[PDB]
Amino acid sequence: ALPQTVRIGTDTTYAPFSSKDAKGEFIGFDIDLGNEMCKRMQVKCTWVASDFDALIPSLKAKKIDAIISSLSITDKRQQEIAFSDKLYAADSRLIAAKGSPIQPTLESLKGKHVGVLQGSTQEAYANDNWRTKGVDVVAYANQDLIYSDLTAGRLDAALQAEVAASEGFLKQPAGKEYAFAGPSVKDKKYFGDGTGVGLRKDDTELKAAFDKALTELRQDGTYDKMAKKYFDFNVYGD
Ligand SMILES: NC(=[NH2+])NCCC[C@H](N)C(=O)O
Numbered sequence: 001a002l003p004q005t006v007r008i009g010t011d012t013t014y015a016p017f018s019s020k021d022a023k024g025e026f027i028g029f030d031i032d033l034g035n036e037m038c039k040r041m042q043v044k045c046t047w048v049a050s051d052f053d054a055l056i057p058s059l060k061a062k063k064i065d066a067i068i069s070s071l072s073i074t075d076k077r078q079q080e081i082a083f084s085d086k087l088y089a090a091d092s093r094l095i096a097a098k099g100s101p102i103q104p105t106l107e108s109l110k111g112k113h114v115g116v117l118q119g120s121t122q123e124a125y126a127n128d129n130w131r132t133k134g135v136d137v138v139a140y141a142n143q144d145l146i147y148s149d150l151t152a153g154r155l156d157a158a159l160q161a162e163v164a165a166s167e168g169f170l171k172q173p174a175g176k177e178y179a180f181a182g183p184s185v186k187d188k189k190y191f192g193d194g195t196g197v198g199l200r201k202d203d204t205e206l207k208a209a210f211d212k213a214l215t216e217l218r219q220d221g222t223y224d225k226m227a228k229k230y231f232d233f234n235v236y237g238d
Contacts, residue, residue, distance in 0.1 A: 002041065002205060002206060003206075005043070005044045005045065006045045006046070007048055007065045008047055008064060009068075010030060010047060010048070010069040011049070011050060011055065011069045011143075013052075013142035013144040015168030015169075016028050016029055016163075016167040019168070020049075026047045028230075030068045030069060032229070033217075034066075036226065037214055039213075040216055043209075048064050053117075055071070055198070056080065059199070060080070066197050066199055067198035068197050070164070071198045073192045073195065074121060074190070077192070082199045082201045082207055083197065083199065084197035084199065084211055086195065087197065087214070088236050089195075089235065089237025089238070090194060091186075091191075092125070092187075092191055093180050093184040093185065094158065095150070095165050095169065095180055096179070096181040097177060097178055098177055098178060099179075100181050102157050103182040104182045104183075109135045111136075112136065113136040113155050113157075114126060114130060114136065114155065114157050114159060116160070117139070117146065121191050122159040122160055138155065143160055143164065146160065147175070157181055163231070163235065166180075167230060167231070194237060197210050223236070
């Protein structure tokens with residue numbers, strides 16, 4: 001009972017996972033994964049762009065059928081929605097101006113303005129640990145606004161996925177003056193364990209079909225060859 005067309009929501013402002021090229025086409029590792037899974041599922045798929053914080057609400061409202069948007073698999077989210085098996089890992093890390101003394105600690109970030117994606121696990125962490133304790137945490141509709149406000153000096157630092165920042169900003173023209181500030185931050189509760197396809201809890205058949213296609217594309221080496229387009233390391237993690 002899979003839909004004739006699976007509607008997949010994604011936030012196209014998170015290179016190299018999900019973004020738009022110059023003529024508006026969806027590109028990145030999430031898009032590649034989704035399209036490959038849809039192929040093996042033998043279903044048509046329609047990509048739907050949305051701000052990140054609108055994805056889970058759109059899913060719950062059945063305006064989309066799935067989310068592939070670096071969606072972290074967390075205990076909290078598992079109470080509202082279901083997930084496919086892990087698509088890849090996604091650690092979190094701060095960036096700031098090169099040579100910045102900033103570390104991902106309250107003491108370091110006091111007085112600093114820190115940008116986070118609204119609706120993200122990074123926002124959850126930053127709100128609880130930093131915002132409550134006086135740090136000017138600013139939440140943004142999308143990650144592109146964060147990068148812009150950073151380079152415009154409205155932000156001192158920003159918290160997002162390590163790989164997104166690296167491949168999508170630090171290794172891009174806009175980020176040549178910026179670097180990681182401190183190590184990545186582990187936090188079981190807030191950050192979860194990898195990303196997955198977000199799905200409605202009752203769509204058992206759809207989850208089975210994604211899980212099946214995902215295992216198959218990992219079995220035959222397609223995952224690693226697709227990954228190699230973007231990463232020279234183990235993006236899957238454990
Ligand atoms: N396409 C995106 N904007 N992805 C952002 C994901 C941020 C983080 N992994 C989360 O699940 O909250």
